[PDB]
Amino acid sequence: TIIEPSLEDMLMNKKAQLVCDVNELVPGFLSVKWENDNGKTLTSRKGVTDKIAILDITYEDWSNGTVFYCAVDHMENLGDLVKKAYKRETGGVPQRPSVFLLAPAEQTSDNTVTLTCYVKDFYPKDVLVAWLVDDEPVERTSSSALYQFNTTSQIQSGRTYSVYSQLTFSNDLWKNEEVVYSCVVYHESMIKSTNIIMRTIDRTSNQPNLVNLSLNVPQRC
Amino acid sequence: TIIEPSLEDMLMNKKAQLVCDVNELVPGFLSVKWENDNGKTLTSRKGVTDKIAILDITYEDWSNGTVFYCAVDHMENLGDLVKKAYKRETGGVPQRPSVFLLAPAEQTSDNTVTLTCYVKDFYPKDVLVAWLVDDEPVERTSSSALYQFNTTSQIQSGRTYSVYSQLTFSNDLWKNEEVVYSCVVYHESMIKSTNIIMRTIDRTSNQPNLVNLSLNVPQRC
Amino acid sequence: TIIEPSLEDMLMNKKAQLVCDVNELVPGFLSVKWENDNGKTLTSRKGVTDKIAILDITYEDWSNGTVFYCAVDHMENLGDLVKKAYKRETGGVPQRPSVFLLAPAEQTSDNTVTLTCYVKDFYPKDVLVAWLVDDEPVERTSSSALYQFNTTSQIQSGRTYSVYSQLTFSNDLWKNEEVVYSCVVYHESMIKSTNIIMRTIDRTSNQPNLVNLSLNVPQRC
Amino acid sequence: TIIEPSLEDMLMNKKAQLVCDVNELVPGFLSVKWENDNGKTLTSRKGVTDKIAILDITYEDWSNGTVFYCAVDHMENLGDLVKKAYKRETGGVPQRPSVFLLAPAEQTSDNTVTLTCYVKDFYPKDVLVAWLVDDEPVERTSSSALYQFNTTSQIQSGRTYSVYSQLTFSNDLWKNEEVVYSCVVYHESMIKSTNIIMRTIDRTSNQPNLVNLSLNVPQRC
Amino acid sequence: TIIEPSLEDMLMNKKAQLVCDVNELVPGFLSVKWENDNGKTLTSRKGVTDKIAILDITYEDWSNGTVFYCAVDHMENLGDLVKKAYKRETGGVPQRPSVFLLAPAEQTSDNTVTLTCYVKDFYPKDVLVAWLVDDEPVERTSSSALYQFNTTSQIQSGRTYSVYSQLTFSNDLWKNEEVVYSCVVYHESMIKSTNIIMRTIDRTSNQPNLVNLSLNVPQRC
Amino acid sequence: TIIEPSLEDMLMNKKAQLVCDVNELVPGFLSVKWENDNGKTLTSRKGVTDKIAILDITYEDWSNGTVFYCAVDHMENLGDLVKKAYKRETGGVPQRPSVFLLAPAEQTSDNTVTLTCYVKDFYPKDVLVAWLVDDEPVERTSSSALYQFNTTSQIQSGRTYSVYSQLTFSNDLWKNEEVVYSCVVYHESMIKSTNIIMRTIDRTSNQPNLVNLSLNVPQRC
Amino acid sequence: TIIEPSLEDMLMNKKAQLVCDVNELVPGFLSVKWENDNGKTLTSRKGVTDKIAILDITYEDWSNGTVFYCAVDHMENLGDLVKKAYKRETGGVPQRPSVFLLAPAEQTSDNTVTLTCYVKDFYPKDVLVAWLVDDEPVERTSSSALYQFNTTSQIQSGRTYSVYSQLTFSNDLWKNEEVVYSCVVYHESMIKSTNIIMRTIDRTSNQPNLVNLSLNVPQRC
Amino acid sequence: TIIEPSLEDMLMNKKAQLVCDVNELVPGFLSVKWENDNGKTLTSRKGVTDKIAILDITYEDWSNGTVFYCAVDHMENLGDLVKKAYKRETGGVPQRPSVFLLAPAEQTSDNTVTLTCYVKDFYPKDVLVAWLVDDEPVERTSSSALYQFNTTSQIQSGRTYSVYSQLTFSNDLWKNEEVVYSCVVYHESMIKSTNIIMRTIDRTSNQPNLVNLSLNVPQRC
Ligand SMILES: *[C@@H]1O[C@H](CO)[C@@H](O[C@@H]2O[C@H](CO)[C@@H](O[C@@H]3O[C@H](CO)[C@@H](O)[C@H](O)[C@@H]3O)[C@H](O)[C@H]2NC(C)=O)[C@H](O)[C@H]1NC(C)=O
Ligand SMILES: *[C@@H]1O[C@H](CO)[C@@H](O[C@@H]2O[C@H](CO)[C@@H](O[C@@H]3O[C@H](CO)[C@@H](O)[C@H](O)[C@@H]3O)[C@H](O)[C@H]2NC(C)=O)[C@H](O)[C@H]1NC(C)=O
Ligand SMILES: *[C@@H]1O[C@H](CO)[C@@H](O[C@@H]2O[C@H](CO)[C@@H](O[C@@H]3O[C@H](CO)[C@@H](O)[C@H](O)[C@@H]3O)[C@H](O)[C@H]2NC(C)=O)[C@H](O)[C@H]1NC(C)=O
Ligand SMILES: *[C@@H]1O[C@H](CO)[C@@H](O[C@@H]2O[C@H](CO)[C@@H](O[C@@H]3O[C@H](CO)[C@@H](O)[C@H](O)[C@@H]3O)[C@H](O)[C@H]2NC(C)=O)[C@H](O)[C@H]1NC(C)=O
Ligand SMILES: *[C@@H]1O[C@H](CO)[C@@H](O[C@@H]2O[C@H](CO)[C@@H](O[C@@H]3O[C@H](CO)[C@@H](O)[C@H](O)[C@@H]3O)[C@H](O)[C@H]2NC(C)=O)[C@H](O)[C@H]1NC(C)=O
Ligand SMILES: *[C@@H]1O[C@H](CO)[C@@H](O[C@@H]2O[C@H](CO)[C@@H](O[C@@H]3O[C@H](CO)[C@@H](O)[C@H](O)[C@@H]3O)[C@H](O)[C@H]2NC(C)=O)[C@H](O)[C@H]1NC(C)=O
Ligand SMILES: *[C@@H]1O[C@H](CO)[C@@H](O[C@@H]2O[C@H](CO)[C@@H](O[C@@H]3O[C@H](CO)[C@@H](O)[C@H](O)[C@@H]3O)[C@H](O)[C@H]2NC(C)=O)[C@H](O)[C@H]1NC(C)=O
């Protein structure tokens, strides 16, 4: 049995859905159930399949740290109860991440270009990084067959966390057209206002004085 | 009797309040009323004073263009009815503004510095502009009124519009802060995602010059 | 009844014309009148229509703060008298604005560029901003199709005023790169010398420095 | 049970050791065993504890892709056999990775700086990265409480990989006259490529400059 | 008897005064007279001394080319009549000048600098050149004592004219300031919109790039 | 009767010719005469016409300040004597001028270009300015109509003077021939040394950028 | 017996002195003599010593190529006659040289700076090169002891010749004076106009864009 | 009798030959002889003709300053002995020479370009300079009229010396955007010192550049 954490972007609307899927498919299955910590009857809903239980959760409970239980009641497995739990690590006071958007270091001869948004020192583990091309998400922009965004794992030093996000596209488009790309960070520290943090960049508006020199001495004979 | 349009900032959360103030204070007053276009009985609420009527409106009605009526029913003015209306032009497809964040142009001497945020070609006439000093609203932060900001009036052309916004503060902070400022543009062209357009100027570092170098001396032909 | 302030540009010749238009057109009309503060018979002139009253005012009176009165004497409205007044505030000493010419705002998405001329703190409200293409006003050469200019309203911080003005044209003309533009500002604090202040821009300015090289010296041990 | 891949740095001497650890510690344990794919008796050695099996492997087998098997023979678990294996993904050919040193990310809030090393593409999933400070990787009187380094996970696209690694230290050391930092990358393609980043001060005029180098000079004493 | 042309700056207000001074002072004098071409009685007035005749002339007459006559009627010289004439060449249509601001000319030996404003190929011979420091005339400043300016004669190449004008001051103001000096050119052709043309110059305008760096990277083998 | 000062270029050979022309041509003429200050008989010569008197003068007399009187002795005018004088102001002590050669300010659009020569602070007040295209007088080369040039009049500030000289030609030549233009200033402040001061602009090459590199990988610990 | 060619600088005044000195001092001496090619009596003068014979020569004869004879008539050597000759190579039309002034190549800290003047392809072998500092000869300047100058030998390729002249002084003086230097070449092809060619140089005025970088790789152990 | 100094290039192998030629050819000749300072019998060899004496010398003697004597023993001249000597002044410490490559001298009139090599300070007054293109001697497969090289004499200020050398060729080859020209200098105080110059073009934007470098890299294979 596997559970999926509620989507962050939606909980930034004070609502979301916590689904619990069942993996014990080797034997038969009977029904899913969503219960409370005390075992009280917690109202729930049914998903596409009977092995999937959906539960609507508001920001109040999610932030407060309340723990819910998803259980499987197969006729053959009723001898035991796999009463999984949704435990959220709480405590501490949120720390605001420090976002840095780094320009690409690829040279002209290179084939593709990558933009990296790096965020450091935020305590709450859950975060989300998205990208915009000019002012529309890359996942929905018309030009979406040549952009590839990804996010790495979280590296923890002390009580805080840090991650690196990425977005890659062809060098020709980087050096041909003129648009502004933005890395958008969703984090809990910014719930009071905006609910979001952003950093923008474009080729023509960086103007870093530069000098490039390459020396090859073949030493050939 | 004067009405005030709902605050866009909170209407982006799909809810808001339309308050109705009464100006005919020269004679006495009896009661306020909030009705529909057809004159039906439209549920309302009461503000601090009896001359103030509050009405809760969702984004559905506001965007659809439904018109409400606020009326005054003074015992002496009952001969007539000042049944004001809230008319909000609806028009057609919106347009996404193109924001530009223009940097200061003053010199080392001037006592003050000014950041300009020009936002152009947004068809709907409802727009809001805020500023963030480092990551939090400039209105509330460590700055004890050290930061001031004001927005100009709107320009028209075609069926579009345009506007500027300015943030002013002493240049001592400008050259001894090492922070990142940002102009936030609340508009309804991006109601499908984020609901905000940002442009930022980063001062956390100052590496104006860069140099790259490579040197291969293959010692084997 | 609506009044129009005397043109500043004309008043930079120590002459102008204060026109008085009548808005109470729902009933009939009889005659216009231009009087003094004391109600004395102040000589006036007549415009195209009987509802338009022209009054010639010299710089002496306008600067001194003298107040004139325009009245309507309709046969039916003679019971009352809507004796309008023209009052220009004059409490202070002028201040010289610091004009700045900000960075160009290009957008290849629509192939258009806009240049912003910003006027900083100046006490007296009366100001006027015009544009020159090379050495003649933009409204002479090709304004009919290529160039469009506009100016916003004033924003008052303390006792002083600021205003933004813009000029917009195609980016293809931007690439001509053989045209210096210039914004000229008229204001009352320059009456002693030339009545204007000028600033200029050119397509080529504030551009970074880049040097790229590759060398292959084939040595021969 | 759990196995640990052979060290890449050691394997750059054409030898290494593959250790096999046992995790089924809930019941007792009897002996470890290291066998071949066919089950033949493969000579092995014993480590500090009986639950640890060490096997010496040369570069020939490791590169060829030969698979070895580690088995546990507990007196109670003899009913079954957990004959784990060591499967290495081998295909195509090594791809020369390009490594970039990204711009530093200063943060005056806590007075720290971070340098990033980004290895773009490399087919085989095995890679190692180390940081040098004037040729002083770690424990060389500097890496005690001054410099910290970590490495992220692998992000895969198509049939290639990439990774980031970071080095963090206080900005006080970042303001020294000149210090040489390097990011050596040991990859199974015998790369051993060192990329240098330095902070230099212009001599004729004093201005901060950031220099990047890539000496490939194969000069050896 | 010598005549003085009307001031151009005043005539940019459509008014001026043509003075007639008498030089035949060796014998006595009786009275001055200002007449028309036909000898008709042309009204005039008198100045400080009886030998000075003032005549008010408007813009129309001056541009049209009308010629006035100044005569002396000494009791002894009445035998003849020295009927002076004011002839102003009219010719064809005007031309505009192309104003240029040439390079500065410094002298460390004498510790002084000089700025030149060159006007090129304007047809009408009447032109005036004035200087501004920041936005006010040089002749009226706290530093006006240490500012010297002058204009040369007119060199006629073909049908057009050219003349040079300069401004000289010490080298310390030049090095240690951020003032923008401007040369203003009044001329008849540029009369419809504004009466003047302007240019600007600043110490830090055209400079060369310079990069000077040194490096020492102790590798090891 | 009018006199012409001796040419400076020839007096830089310590010899010259002082010609005396006669203007009283309304009546007849008899003979010219060249005398001394004391009226003594000063030997002279005869020019093309009897009304022209030539007198050979060396540098000694010219510099010393000696005067000479040219007189007309017409049979009818013998009643009086128009005994003109050649008075050359002398005093002070020569001051060597400073020469500045100012490059053209024009751009690639206009079809004419101009070079400027600014000579300043020459006390004797006797200068001559010439131009050389390629070490050849502009007036004796293979393109005379293709080059035009005139100098302005002196402007005096204290006891010194200053002048401007201009050389004008088409913009096509300025981009093609790649020659070395120079401005030659004849003055008496340096008779002891070379009698001229030159300033040159060289256009025989165009290497706007120059890079210097040096490597050293000592192979000795 | 040794002869010295007449000075050129003075031959540019159409006069000079050809002196012949006697070296046969081992025996006694009687008298010097200056004769013609035909042996005719050529008038001469006597110098400081009886062994030195001076002969005044004009530029007409010197250019024509006439050969003179200087002879020694010692009482003991009268048996023979050492009738030396002054033969000038006059075999073609003069060719004007092309002079190039080269800026110093010293970078910094070199303690010395050199200025080179290279003359190219002049036919007549006789030429002189001199140097001027702020337009005053180096020999008779206040800072004469701070400057050194020298001229190399002549290298003949075909029918023409070429030379290199040099001027060396301290680097600090080069970087802390802001003066203008100039190399002046005296040659015969320029007798028509100014008798000389001249090139000028200045540190600040001549400053193309440049980049200077060095890289030591101390291979320490 | 004339002698020829030993070749420096050969002496860079610690051996050479000192040839002694005889000029007293007017009378007969008998035999040559090579002796020591003391007159002792110093072994020698015979060249093509009897009048030429060859003597093999190692670096030891040549550097030490030993002086040899060459004598002629003609049957008629035996009355005297013209015992020539080979004395090389060598009393001082060697100092490294500094080599500069001055700016090219382009003469488009003749379509030629000359490069200059300048050796600034070498104490031993024996030096050799060679030019090479593409790492090939100018006299190797490049000795045709395509290239021409020469060297000037030596100029000494005090204890040191300096020289100039030139290489001339048509500028058609100079327009080839990539060729390497080098100076190699042999001198006692060193062994070899190369200095290359190239004529490249900026890759991103066309802008010719002139590069100059001195790769001291041992690079010995
Ligand atoms: C580099 O990054 C890795 C990955 O974040 C760091 O290892 C991780 O360290 C954290 C703790 O800082 C581990 O989380 C938890 O640690 C506590 C320690 O008491 C433990 O009780 C929890 O059960 C949990 O393990 C995390 O699991 C661990 N991850 C891995 C893959 O090792 C590492 O410390 C970082 N090193 C440096 C020098 O920054
Ligand atoms: C410069 O900006 C000003 C302010 O936007 C422009 O004036 C405005 O021009 C628009 C053009 O459509 C006017 O729209 C009109 O609105 C009234 C509202 O009652 C409507 O009845 C008309 O049919 C029309 O839609 C707007 O009123 C007007 N506002 C003001 C204060 O004048 C001005 O036109 C701009 N300059 C240029 C050159 O366009
Ligand atoms: C931002 O700009 C706006 C527009 O200029 C400022 O609003 C203006 O503020 C001034 C100063 O308080 C107001 O002047 C007042 O005018 C009334 C008469 O209308 C007079 O009775 C008062 O004594 C005072 O002089 C002006 O009316 C007001 N205009 C508008 C349209 O609101 C605003 O204060 C600026 N600063 C901000 C918003 O922080
Ligand atoms: C962003 O980076 C992550 C790094 O994990 C990428 O996820 C990984 O993508 C690779 C390549 O598709 C997956 O490899 C696959 O592994 C399975 C066995 O686990 C194998 O059966 C497949 O044939 C293939 O080799 C890898 O599993 C997958 N890992 C995870 C945790 O998802 C992700 O695809 C990257 N996304 C973008 C947009 O670049
Ligand atoms: C700008 O340049 C003009 C032209 O040189 C200057 O005017 C000239 O100034 C000089 C020196 O004061 C005058 O010389 C003297 O004039 C008086 C009066 O005629 C005479 O008695 C003296 O013997 C001597 O010649 C010169 O005449 C005068 N010329 C003109 C046409 O005014 C002018 O002063 C310069 N501007 C400034 C601010 O100095
Ligand atoms: C490099 O420069 C040297 C400069 O000396 C050139 O050597 C000189 O070449 C000229 C060629 O005409 C020689 O002229 C000859 O002079 C003798 C009398 O000495 C005369 O009898 C001949 O008829 C002819 O005029 C000159 O003597 C000679 N000088 C020396 C010292 O060698 C050399 O040729 C130049 N080489 C190149 C490749 O440019
Ligand atoms: C310019 O360069 C020339 C050539 O190097 C310099 O001429 C040289 O000057 C030195 C003296 O400073 C002479 O050295 C002396 O030579 C005599 C024998 O001739 C010897 O007895 C002395 O003890 C001393 O060594 C050297 O001969 C001479 N070389 C030539 C070729 O003339 C000249 O000094 C430099 N400076 C100037 C201003 O010309």
Numbering used by the authors:
A (entry chain B), B (entry chain C), C (entry chain D), D (entry chain A), E (entry chain E), F (entry chain F), ...: 225 to 445
Pull text from the paper.
Polymeric (p) immunoglobulins (Igs) serve broad functions during vertebrate immune responses. Typically, pIgs are comprised of two to six Ig monomers, each of which contains two heavy chains and two light chains that form one fragment crystallization (Fc) and two antigen-binding fragments (Fabs). To assemble pIgs, plasma cells typically link multiple copies of heavy chains together with a protein called the joining chain (JC); however, incorporation of the JC is variable among species and heavy chain class.
We utilized this tIgM Fc (tFcµ) to determine a cryo-EM structure to an average resolution of 2.78 Å. The refined tFcµ structure contains four tFcµ monomers (Fcµ1 to Fcµ4) that lay approximately flat on one plane and include interfaces between Fcµ1 and Fcµ2, Fcµ2 and Fcµ3, Fcµ3 and Fcµ4. Fcµ1 and Fcµ4 are separated by Tp residues, which form a β-sandwich (hereafter termed Tp assembly) comprising two β-strands from each of the four Fcµs. Despite similarity between the two halves of the tetramer, the complex is not symmetrical with respect to all four Fcs; rather, adjacent tFcs are related by distinct angles measuring 81°, 72°, 86°, for Fcµ1 and Fcµ2, Fcµ2 and Fcµ3, Fcµ3 and Fcµ4, respectively. Specifically, the C-terminal 38 residues (residues 411–448; FG loop, G strand and Tp) adopt one of two folds, with chains A and H adopting an A-type fold and chains B-G adopting a B-type fold. In the A-type fold, the FG loop and the G strand include residues 411–416 and 417–426, respectively, and the Tp folds back to form β-sheet interactions with the G strand. In the B-type fold, the FG loop and the G strand instead include residues 411–420 and 421–426, respectively, resulting in Tp β-strand (residues 434–441) being directed away from CHµ4 where they form β-sheet interactions with other Tp(s) rather than the G strand. Cysteine to serine mutation at this residue produced a tFcµ monomer in solution and eliminated evidence of inter-chain disulfide bonding, further suggesting a critical role in tIgM polymeric assembly.
